Ligand binder design. Structure first.
Ligand SMILES: NC(=O)c1ccc[n+]([C@@H]2O[C@H](COP(=O)([O-])OP(=O)(O)OC[C@H]3O[C@@H](n4cnc5c(N)ncnc54)[C@H](O)[C@@H]3O)[C@@H](O)[C@H]2O)c1
Ligand SMILES: NC(=O)c1ccc[n+]([C@@H]2O[C@H](COP(=O)([O-])OP(=O)(O)OC[C@H]3O[C@@H](n4cnc5c(N)ncnc54)[C@H](O)[C@@H]3O)[C@@H](O)[C@H]2O)c1
Ligand SMILES: NC(=O)c1ccc[n+]([C@@H]2O[C@H](COP(=O)([O-])OP(=O)(O)OC[C@H]3O[C@@H](n4cnc5c(N)ncnc54)[C@H](O)[C@@H]3O)[C@@H](O)[C@H]2O)c1
Ligand SMILES: NC(=O)c1ccc[n+]([C@@H]2O[C@H](COP(=O)([O-])OP(=O)(O)OC[C@H]3O[C@@H](n4cnc5c(N)ncnc54)[C@H](O)[C@@H]3O)[C@@H](O)[C@H]2O)c1
Lengths: 323, 340, 334, 339
């Protein structure tokens, strides 16, 4: 066994728990830390308003959660591993887990440029046994990276810009009000607004695909759904192309690809909730705009920003064993 | 001669109280807001005052400085002092009276901190225990005196239920009754499922995509406002997926046998000219009450009498803008209280 | 096997299909107003109940599931659907909302169908069955039967057992109900012209008339005349709850009422039990017609005047559908 | 001496047009004198008075069996399915028709109004290429006295047009693509089900999905701005709000620019512009509900991405897809009076 401590039993920690359980394949969790009663953590694991009720026996004791007759010890220690709090988002900060005997830490978020950022099935081949603190990137990184990686190999991305139409998340407010950081848009009611939101996924995409350093920028629009997101990429490419050419080329790279999938059934956001891909290419939205020989190419991939990302993070976790 | 107000907590209720006082113009000239305390930048407080996802954009010139917000050229000093006893607004700004709207000072002992800071009087924007007076304007505001120092404006649900229950009891006699309020979500709830202050299993759940049962004390505690109904009511809420606008259903055993039209006529007469307890028979829905100025809006279209022989239940319903309708009630009480 | 024609592949007809399919150890044809391509698509991808774990496609005239073919028609008049000669239809599961009577569902009989089970209230001149309350009143003689409404299937076992244990003198219901297809996304004119049905469903709490309490005597004769109620339609896509407030014959406490109702949920696939402080999402996809929630029980007393509030959750779509499939199974094998 | 308007189709757009013209009437100058719609006046009056998006009208509204009454004034409601039979020119003094039914969306169809004696018709939608498509404050100067049937374009056209027009004037757009992140509309479904046209996305529940949707506003923009014919494409993502939308434009420009340069250049065209506004307060979609612009430039989202010689520029404008479009149409009705 490699024994996992999940720090932060939030949307991503609980979902990582669910994924590792359902892989029952042999990876296993053995303990958890949050700011919360074991009772409420077990209740949250069992009942999920996005992902439905866990088909397992779930209960709590005074210091643990219990699932299917196994005990998982729980702590309430605010100062510190699958690091999922959002409070240890750097190598400097994620220092305590090393500082008490982990071989490694995988942070569930971007965590700077002085460590490696991994998108499974794009660049997980750079991991070495020396790698102790590793970023699994953002949810948007795991969706955008394979699209841009394959689109670039095929056609040469000169420059690109991204807009993700993204589900609301726990950083946002239910109703308008003061918000940590003071941001004017973070402050606003998430369920009844389209809310522009800054993202680093395009700008920092060089950490995953070095040759795309400096070549992409983007942002998000946070919209009134609980989960399920889509990334639009508009690029100037080296090659002149048509939409059918683009689709056929990208599609090839989805074949058997558990990280970067494909759907041509004219799906909508709900349909990706509970999917296991980091990114789902949608050829039905591909558009090539041309006049003379000046050309814009729009491509799109969907993603369960919660569970798709979580599945990517678990794959990267499982790969730590091979090192 | 104006009583100078310090608003503690420039949240949904504190900002709307500001909007209400402003729009009242000369009708609110007995008071004057001079200072605001919260946990944030003046820049964000001004921005939240100006742009409101529920109630729309304020038709006023709003800006911020490094220590104040400015509205139509009037300056309102801003503090960010989490401990109320340390807010220096009595000395610095002349504050006489604190409008307490944080949610964190809802008791006599807690709001003592404002008196320790030098305030003369405090009106709390919530229930705040039984050792102080709880006022629903136009039901029991007559119990206020010049000697009160810390008073509760009650809850949103109290301000909706009270006049309905008051007048229904006066006309017919409520023997026992139960309430269900179908209530907009509020800022105590969660956007997505997760740990929540208090550890409550339902309060932890995503508010925009669930009907969520929620405890309320308005019915059980209604004797604080209407002594004769002490012990006669209980109830609860269902928090539902709208930002604002709520309704209270009351099911009662009455001392009189009735029809819906009889109950409607008898209650309606108490809404006539009543700025606190209104009446709407247009078959409205929740969003229609957003921005209204009543604590309670009786809806005769939902009255139901259920009988089999001499066994009877009677269901009555009143809408409320839990934000602005309550706020308007609290400002009425504020105007009365401040000037005793 | 008895061969089912599903008329109306809407929310309920598609879910009936999914339920029949998941049950494993049935359906031969389908009618609607639309292409086989779109019906296949809607059976596969569902915004409420998720993606069907089956291989689904469409031919020019039929849907395909796990290599099995189901014929599709687009015939507005039930009389005119040729599924009895073409497909062997012996039994119509009537799910359109437009044949909601014995008079109207007669058209299936004229089309050659042996029986009809209507997925809705359908008058008082036929039987209305809530499975595990009154399904013993079915016989071989019956041809057109009502599976009730979604609200009837929630309210009925709750009222039934409460009445059996305590005696209901009178009661009123409020169901806090998911929006449905009869409502609008934005405000505008609606069929029937009702001022509330006209209003945007996702951003309002909307009072709505219901007949389930008033008509409950069709299911539970001794409660004829003793119940009324209504709905509040709220901004969720599925998942509902029914509150009942009643005057009882017996004096009670909440713990007493909870224990007495709970015993009738033991092993009961129609009327279940949940005391984990659930919320509406949690019942989406559940297979009960009704889920008693003892956490919401309340007994209000002053002197000898007493009111009792009890509540049951329901997946108004799938819970109802599972009820209907139970009744189908019984009704078709008689 | 007032311009008198007949509204054909008292839907969301017709009702908002009534509300706009009422409020201008408070006191430049235009009044509604009659309506044609097949719904009962009682329901129409109810929907004029209460609205889940735009709030309650601050007026006394009631109904008779053939009219709506507002503030003591009677507004006849005709119920003619064929527009050539609406009698409101000789009965009510109708000068111009605002055609908002969705069923007269062509020059040849709306001829019916002219046959009933209307001087001019404005259609509340795209209506083909054999009549003029006018975005007020972009190309309304092309109207002449001979223009009797005119299209307002779409709501999207009214947002995109001024952004594209001014951006092209300042910098030259070589090619561009649009994504509008758009509030759900009446054509969509509350819950998944069969849908007119059979489209797989149109079929889906609108309140709980982000739904891709085809648009024509970018492709057809040459009708408004001829030099952009053939240069733009785009689509929409329909999202879970009742109203309030934004249009993103990504373009290759003739000039090398910075973000600040782009912002300043576009900003100067918003100044005093009642049709194409400006907001740099970091607003969100609800903040535009009830605003009167067809388009609201938001410099906070401008982005310029550049690697060596290749450059992309993203610019964004917000819009009340209902009321901003409505206010554009009323501007064009007022312009009709000067022809
Ligand atoms: N939600 C998504 O779609 C998504 C996708 C990818 C990555 N992420 C990232 O994952 C992280 C968590 O996101 P989430 O959506 O799960 O948020 P969340 O709020 O659901 O989870 C955070 C959890 O951490 C706990 N916590 C907070 N401070 C803590 C501390 N000092 N010690 C221990 N526990 C603490 C909280 O109580 C909470 O349960 C963030 O870094 C986020 O950016 C989120
Ligand atoms: N929202 C409603 O419908 C409603 C109706 C009636 C009463 N109330 C009551 O009014 C109060 C506030 O509710 P709300 O909805 O406005 O909440 P809110 O969260 O919008 O506002 C709370 C405000 O108080 C501030 N705050 C918190 N702690 C503070 C401290 N120590 N010092 C200074 N400021 C602090 C917050 O930053 C926030 O701006 C609560 O007691 C609530 O029960 C609310
Ligand atoms: N949604 C629920 O929660 C629910 C629960 C229980 C019962 N019901 C009842 O079941 C019935 C259907 O409800 P729904 O929610 O599935 O509605 P729906 O709108 O989803 O389904 C109706 C289907 O019937 C089709 N249809 C309409 N007219 C037709 C005709 N003449 N011939 C063939 N097909 C036709 C429509 O195209 C649509 O696909 C109603 O009677 C309703 O009261 C609904
Ligand atoms: N809904 C929007 O926000 C929106 C936005 C931009 C453009 N539009 C366009 O405006 C028009 C309608 O949109 P809406 O949202 O106001 O429509 P709606 O569906 O809200 O109302 C349409 C109205 O037309 C009436 N009608 C139908 N046939 C008629 C006939 N033969 N004669 C007279 N009246 C008739 C109906 O009785 C109804 O009241 C269309 O051209 C549409 O594309 C709508």
């Amino acid at each position: 066994s490699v024994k996992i401590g999940i720090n932060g039993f939030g949307r991503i920690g609980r979902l990582a728990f669910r994924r590792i359980l359902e892989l029952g394949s042999d990876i296993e969790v053995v303990a958890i830390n949050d700011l919360t009663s074991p009772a409420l953590l077990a209740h949250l694991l069992k009942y999920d308003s996005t992902h439905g009720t866990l088909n397992a026996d779930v209960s709590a004791t005074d210091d643990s959660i219990v699932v299917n007759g196994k005990n998982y010890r729980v702590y309430a220690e605010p100062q510190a591993v699958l690091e999922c709090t959002g409070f240890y988002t750097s190598k400097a900060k994620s220092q305590a887990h090393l500082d008490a005997g982990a071989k490694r830490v995988l942070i569930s978020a971007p965590a700077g440029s002085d460590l490696k950022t991994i998108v499974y099935n794009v660049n997980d081949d750079i991991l070495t046994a020396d790698d102790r603190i590793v970023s699994a990137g953002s949810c948007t990184t795991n969706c955008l990276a394979p699209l841009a990686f394959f689109e670039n190999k095929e056609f040469g991305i000169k420059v690109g810009t991204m807009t993700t139409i993204h589900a609301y998340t726990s950083t946002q407010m239910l109703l308008d009000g003061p918000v940590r950081g003071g941001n004017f848009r973070a402050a606003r009611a998430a369920g009844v607004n389209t809310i522009p939101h800054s993202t680093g996924a395009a700008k920092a995409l060089g950490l995953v695909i070095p040759e795309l350093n400096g070549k992409l920028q983007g942002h998000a629009q946070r919209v009134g759904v609980v989960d399920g997101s889509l990334t639009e990429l508009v690029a100037i490419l080296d090659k002149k192309v048509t939409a059918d050419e683009v689709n056929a080329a990208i599609k090839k790279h989805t074949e058997g690809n558990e990280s970067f999938g494909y759907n041509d059934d004219e799906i909508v956001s709900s349909d990706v909730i509970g999917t296991t891909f980091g990114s789902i290419f949608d050829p039905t939205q591909t558009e090539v705009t041309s006049d003379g020989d000046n050309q814009l190419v729009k491509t799109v991939a969907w993603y369960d920003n919660e569970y798709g990302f979580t599945c990517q993070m678990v794959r990267t976790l499982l790969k730590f064993a091979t090192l």
